[PDB]
Every structure is written in C-alpha cells, then in structure tokens.
Nucleic acid binder design. Structure first.
Length: 88
DNA sequence: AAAAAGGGGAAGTGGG
DNA sequence: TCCCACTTCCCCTTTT
C-alpha cells in the first residue's frame, strides 16, 4: 500500500489540494500545511488507507514525526512546515 | 490567558 | 508467527 510521504509528495507535484498544502521552498523540499484546511487532506489520507477510524491532522503528524527517525521527512521550525529529504 | 501546534510511549491494526 | 508502516489513545510541553 502507499506510504504517507509519497501520498504527500504526489499531491505537491500534481497540484490538487493547494488550499491544504503547498511548497514553502520547492528546490529545498520544504512544504507547509494550511491551518484551516489541513483536516480535509488528513481525512483523504485515511479514506485512501481504508482505516476503520477517521484520520485527523493530529494522527497524521504523529505518523509524520516517525519519519524524523528514519530521515524521510523532517520538521522545520516554522508553523506547519516540514521538509522532504534528498528524494525531493 | 487561551488555543493551536508539537510531542511521544505504548498498545493495536492490516498487509505481506 | 513475525515485521513493517502506520494508527489510535491519551496526555503532556511549547509556540503563537
């Protein structure tokens, strides 16, 4: 099944959900979530995953924080902004 | 102050 | 069975 980081990257590079997420610094791989619209993106993640419960941004960031352990995505010190590793 | 964002141990779930 | 990649819970610390 698809990985969360790909889900997010595929969205950035396609362009749907520009109300929910966008590139802060594309070349560098920095992307940011919208405060008011992040939930709609998080819910789509769950619908797609086929989770039995409803996906929230809180639970999605919980998973996101795990990539900081393996390096795929890291949190940047700006509100709702993360950064993909040399893979973006 | 108050609310949003950030955090993380640990048990639980689904697919392979 | 076990492993992985989250997912759910629940509650606490920091930034805005």
């Amino acid at each position: 099944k698809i990985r969360l980081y790909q889900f997010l990257l595929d969205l950035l590079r396609s362009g749907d959900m520009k109300d929910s997420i966008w590139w802060v610094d594309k070349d560098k791989g920095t992307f940011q979530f919208s405060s008011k619209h992040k939930e709609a993106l998080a819910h789509r993640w769950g619908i797609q995953k086929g989770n039995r419960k409803k996906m929230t941004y809180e639970k999605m960031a919980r998973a996101l924080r795990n990539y900081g352990k393996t390096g795929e995505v890291k949190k940047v010190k700006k509100k709702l902004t993360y950064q993909f590793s040399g893979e973006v």
